[model samples]
Target: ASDGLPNKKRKRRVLFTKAQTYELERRFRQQRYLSAPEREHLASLIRLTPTQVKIWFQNHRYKTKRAQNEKGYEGHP
Candidate 1:
């Protein structure tokens, strides 16, 4: 039966492998922001899309900042 209707899309998850995670973390520790070429290079090396890499860095920075703020508030009444 050719209904000519496209199949429904399914949500998929992308999980990073150990090596990819390690490299990304290592680079993050060194530099939080990456230039266009840097992003392209890292994306190719880690086998992840540039968008994924960019998002990872963004989330990592946010988490780091949040943790620091929490630590600073620990001594406040």
Candidate 2:
């Protein structure tokens, strides 16, 4: 029975623990891109899906690049 609401799936919010976040940051500092096996291994170590690991790296790179851009603008003549 529909209660006048569309049956749309909502996006899930994955919250990483402190350890997971730390490990991910550490790995990101080492390398921005990961091969298939590297992603799988990191996912296993952090207990997250490979897709999540990929997304984390993608978002991290975006944030870092944005920060660098902003820093450059601040020093513009």
Candidate 3:
């Protein structure tokens, strides 16, 4: 859905499939942040751009932090 009064072409949102999500989840479980080279590498393996990978972890970390501040952050060893 878009709110366009001038019929402007808003960019469509990108959605990742479970394939990417699964790997992303596994990696995030271990590492909350990624180095530039590692981010570049994960992008190719996940068939996504580095920016997308960057944003994914970026948003995910904020979300987890907020969740922790409220209830608790889901954690692992």
Q: Please name the candidate that would achieve the greatest TM-score relative to the true structure.
A: 2
Query: Clashes in model 3: which pairs?
Result: none
- Please give, for residues 1-77, the per-residue lDDT of candidate 2 as tens digits: 85878678877888777787777887798999989698868888989898878888888989998798887585657
lDDT of 3 by residue, 5-51 (tens): 76657768788778887777767878998897987677778888888
Kindly give the stretch of ten consecutive residues in candidate 1 with the minimal lDDT sum: 68-77
After superposing candidate 1 on the true structure, give the runs of residues whose Cα lies further than 4 Å from its correct spot.
1-12, 74-77
Root mean square deviation (Cα) for candidate 1: 5.7
Cα error, residue 58 of model 3, in Å, equals 0.1
Number of colliding residue pairs in model 2: 0
lDDT of 1 at 33: 90
Which residue pairs in candidate 2 have backbone atoms (N, alpha carbon, C) closer than 3 angstroms, thus clashing? Answer: none
Greater-lDDT candidate between 1 and 3 = 1
Best model number under lDDT: 2
Question: In model 2, what lDDT does residue 32 have?
Answer: 90
Question: RMSDs, each prediction?
Answer: 5.7, 4.7, 7.5
Report lDDT (Cα) of residue 14, candidate 2. 81
Off by over 4 Å in 2: 1-7, 74-77
Global CA lDDT computed for model 1: 0.82
